[PDB]
From TrEMBL, chain B:
Organism name: Sus scrofa
Protein name, per record: Large ribosomal subunit protein uL18m
Main location as per UniProt: mitochondrion
Keyword Mitochondrion: yes
Keywords: Mitochondrion, Ribonucleoprotein, Ribosomal protein, Signal
UniProtKB/TrEMBL annotation, chain D:
Coiled-coil portions: none
Stated name of the protein: Large ribosomal subunit protein mL38
Protein family per UniProt: Belongs to the phosphatidylethanolamine-binding protein family. Mitochondrion-specific ribosomal protein mL38 subfamily.
Cellular localisation: Mitochondrion
Source species taxonomy: Eukaryota, Metazoa, Chordata, Craniata, Vertebrata
Any one GO cellular component localisation term in the record: cytosol
The entry's keywords: Coiled coil, Mitochondrion, Ribonucleoprotein, Ribosomal protein, Transit peptide
Annotated transmembrane regions: none
The UniProt record lists the keyword Lyase: no
Lineage: superkingdom: Eukaryota
Range within the parent protein: 145 to 336 of 380
């Protein structure tokens, strides 16, 4: 599993709404083009986690909890860390 | 879904009814006794036959998780036991 | 910060916050501490030092994220 | 007998069948999907199968007479991306000698199912009609593996009634089908 989660390699988009006030963070990146992920882990994410995969893009995940941006972003990266960890080894 | 079984002195019938009262499917003794030329008199073997029939038809109709509520007295009879046996043998889950 | 108050790090302190009429008087409050609850922190201005008794997690987060300095006493 | 059971099964579940006005079948149609060493049999109406084995051309056998003409159809309604009452027809074949499909002229080649997510179970119907004589269909589109608008607005009462009054809904069949993991690839093929 990884730690740093090199965001600069990824793509971030923010989506906010008004009414309860919610701030939604979205992370999108190419799975097969990621050199920061191990070989089996990638293909594992491409199968088990394929539910989050689309034909036009590899991995896209969205999370919203706190009104802040990088908090929800940290939730996204944490989800990434969990998916990678569970793919690598229990 | 419920299973209503009417046992008589001659034949025995089994009906499946939706909440609206409409019959989802039905299996009786007489018709299949005409088709298969099986013994028309009431028997446990015949009950197993129409049980497997109703099973198959319910499986083809996509009917799963069916409720069977026999009367407390005759529920201990071998016929109803082998009815539930023939039904469970179909692969359904009660 | 947007009101044109004192920018630099050194003079900034609770006293200066008192002079700016932005503080709450606590005459009947014994052992008065100072805490920071996060809000309105989205894309706020940068390079500002803040010295408080105890700052909340999201406060220190928000401040440090934009390059600010959190002083815990 | 089997007939009355088929009637009660036909008119006892799906209301869209009455909206299409199609009468209850008296004909014992037998459809069997054969893929590799595996054989999935829809048989009676209302069966549940996956789109995986439904991606191939099935086998249609009902009381074969090779000196007669028949009409085969396969349709489905998920409602798709448009308002209800719009029908989506996967297969259209006309002028079929006997039960053999290969000898029949295919107007609309077989298109494998592509259900959406959380859309529930979808009704798939095989409509089989009798022909007194070969009916020439003009104005009808000539579809490809990828097409959309021509496949929709195919609803029965504006088609079966208007175009051919000589075709009686002799045979009929039904099976239910839901979402699987093979939809994404099909959608990818449709976007290209």
């Amino acid at each position: 599993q990884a730690n740093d989660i090199p965001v600069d390699r990824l793509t971030i988009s923010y989506c906010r709404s008004s009414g309860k006030v919610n701030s939604k963070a979205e992370v999108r990146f190419h799975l097969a083009s990621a050199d920061w992920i191990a070989e089996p882990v990638r293909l594992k994410l491409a199968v088990k986690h394929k539910n989050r995969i689309n034909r036009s893009g590899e991995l896209i995940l969205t999370s919203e909890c706190s009104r802040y941006q990088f908090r929800n972003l940290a939730d996204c990266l944490q989800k990434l860390r969990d998916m990678i960890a569970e793919a690598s080894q229990p | 879904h419920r299973l209503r079984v009417i046992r008589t002195q001659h034949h025995i019938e089994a009906l499946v009814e939706h909440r609206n009262g409409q019959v989802v499917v039905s299996a009786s003794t007489r018709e299949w006794a005409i088709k298969k030329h099986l013994y028309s008199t009431r028997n446990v073997v015949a009950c197993e036959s129409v049980g497997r029939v109703l099973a198959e038809r319910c499986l083809e109709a996509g009917i799963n998780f069916m409720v069977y509520h026999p009367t407390p007295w005759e529920a201990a009879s071998d016929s109803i036991k082998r009815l539930q046996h023939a039904m469970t043998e179909g692969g359904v889950v009660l | 910060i947007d009101l044109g108050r004192v920018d630099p790090t050194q003079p900034i302190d609770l006293t200066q916050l008192v002079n700016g009429r932005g503080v709450t008087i606590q005459p009947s409050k014994r052992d008065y501490g100072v805490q920071l609850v996060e809000e309105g922190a989205d894309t706020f201005k940068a390079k500002v030092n803040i010295e408080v008794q105890m700052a909340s997690e999201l406060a220190i987060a928000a401040i440090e994220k934009n390059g600010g300095v959190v002083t815990t006493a | 007998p089997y007939h009355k059971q088929r009637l009660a099964e036909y008119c006892g579940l799906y209301r869209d069948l009455f909206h299409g006005a199609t009468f209850v079948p008296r004909v014992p149609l037998h459809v069997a999907y054969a893929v590799g060493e595996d054989d999935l049999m829809p048989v009676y109406h209302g069966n549940e199968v996956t789109p995986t084995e439904a991606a191939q051309a099935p086998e249609v056998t009902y009381e074969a007479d090779e000196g007669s003409l028949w009409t085969l159809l396969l349709t489905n309604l998920d409602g798709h991306l448009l308002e209800p009452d719009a029908e989506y027809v996967h297969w259209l074949v006309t002028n079929i000698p006997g039960n053999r499909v290969t000898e029949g002229q295919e107007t609309c080649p077989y298109l494998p199912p592509f259900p959406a997510r959380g859309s529930g179970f979808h009704r798939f119907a095989f409509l089989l009609f009798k022909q007194d004589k070969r009916i020439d269909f003009s104005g009808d589109t000539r579809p490809s593996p990828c097409y959309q608008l021509a496949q929709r607005t195919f609803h029965t009462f504006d088609f079966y009634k208007k175009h051919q009054d000589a075709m009686t809904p002799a045979g009929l069949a039904f099976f239910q089908c839901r979402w699987d993991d093979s939809v994404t690839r099909v959608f990818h093929q449709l976007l290209d």
